[PDB]
Amino acid sequence: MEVNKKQLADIFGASIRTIQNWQEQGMPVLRGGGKGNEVLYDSAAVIKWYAERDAC
Amino acid sequence: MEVNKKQLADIFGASIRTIQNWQEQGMPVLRGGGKGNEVLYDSAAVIKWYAERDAC
Amino acid sequence: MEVNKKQLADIFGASIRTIQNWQEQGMPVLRGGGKGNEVLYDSAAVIKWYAERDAC
Amino acid sequence: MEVNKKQLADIFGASIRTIQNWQEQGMPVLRGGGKGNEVLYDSAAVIKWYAERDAC
Amino acid sequence: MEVNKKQLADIFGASIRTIQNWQEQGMPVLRGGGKGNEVLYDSAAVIKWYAERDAC
Amino acid sequence: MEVNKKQLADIFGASIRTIQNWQEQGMPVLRGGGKGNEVLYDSAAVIKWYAERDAC
Amino acid sequence: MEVNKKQLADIFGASIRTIQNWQEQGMPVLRGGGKGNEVLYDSAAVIKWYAERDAC
Amino acid sequence: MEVNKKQLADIFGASIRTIQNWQEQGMPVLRGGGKGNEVLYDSAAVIKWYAERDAC
Secondary structure, three states, X not given: OEEEHHXXXXXXXXXHHHHXXXXXXXXXXXXXXXXXXXXXXXHHHHHXXXXXXXXX | OEEOHHHHHHHHXXXXXXXXXXXXXXXXXXXXXXXXXXXXXXXXXXXXHHHHHOEO | OXXXXXXXXXXXXXXXXXXXXXXXXXXXXXXXXXXXXXXXXEHHHHHHHHHOOOOO | OEXXXXXXXXXXXXXXXXXXXXXXXXXXXXXXXXXXEOOEEEHHHHHHHHHOOXXX | OEXXXXXXXXXXXXXXXXXXXXXXXXXXXXXXXXXXXOOEEEHHHHHHHHHHOOEO | OEEOHHHHHHHHOOOHHHHHHHHHOOOOOOXXXXXXXXXXXXXXXXXXXXXXXXXX | OEEEHHHHHHHHOOXXXXXXXXXXXXXXXXXXXOOOOOOEEEHHHHXXXXXXXXXX | OEEEHHHHHHHHXXXXXXXXXXXXXXXXXXXXXXXXXXXXXXXXXXXXXXXXXXXX
16 A cells, blocks of 8 residues: 555554665655655555565 | 554555465464454564565 | 443444444554454544544 | 563554554663664563553 | 463563462463463463553 | 665765755755655756756 | 674574574573663574474 | 864764774765875764664
């Protein structure tokens, strides 16, 4: 599902700064409008990204 | 995040049948009652369980 | 007060499925204590949530 | 005992999200460590903090 | 979580004698299965009991 | 690529303050975000903007 | 020897995820300072625990 | 801002030695140069590095 940074953090039971550090490490982001629009995330793709970090 | 089966499925980009199927394999359930009760899930704990299943 | 889903729907004169909607929309839930006892609610907090829905 | 966020949550019959919310409210942390090692908690110290929070 | 007497003491950072005295004062216990299974505890229920001892 | 202020400054071999100064001078921003939203930049767009500014 | 989590994984030829699950299973941990110092391990103590998992 | 070792220490309310020790621990340096070059720092990047050090 479509989530904002705050909603993503809550889904992971994590800090917002925990979210931002993951972004720096190549964590996927969705879209918006270009200046005047919050960063959006696909929870499914973030979960897949989190999982493949330590997949064999 | 505390979510229902439909929400958890949305979060994972999965079918409800996949969530039921994960539960049968031992996926953690947060307070979820029995009868007259919808089940609540810890999205964060289900995500933890997910990654550790094919983790190294 | 400490109420279950049945008691809460009762207090709101609503269907249980309606209570399940409010939960999916972000309505506050207590911390029961695991997959043994039901979801619990704080009636006071649910009322404030209900009221702050169209408080602006 | 020394536990991770998921264990502390299991111990309290709570969500991982509830643990994070408690962390923001001043809930004691044993080994926050540093980005590289997850956060460790003193279950005894968290319980003492929980009990002192709604006590006379 | 489901714990034995030794695990519950460690969770409380306490003496097993401390636990046995809580039992006498009415601290909640789980069930088992006729000769073999030790006394089991719901950590969540025990914390709830610990806190209610002088809650407002 | 989509980067935060620190990453952009790292990419340019510049201080974060120079990035803020470029922002005030009309450097393109990708995700302005709400509050609690960090600012996201398009590295490719900031580079094009950089080259145009003293190009002949 | 005294090692941090990254160092113990390398000693074991393992992922960080593997070390964390062992911790969850009761693998010994040292002490520190209180949220600042990383989790520390006694390699000797950890090896004894690894071996005693199915020593006769 | 771009500041020298003495300025950064003053900004942090810290000893120059602490700054050196943070440098050994991986703290970002801006204009480092070689010899006949004193070290410049991005105060904004050092602050970010500081906060994420014991952040969740």
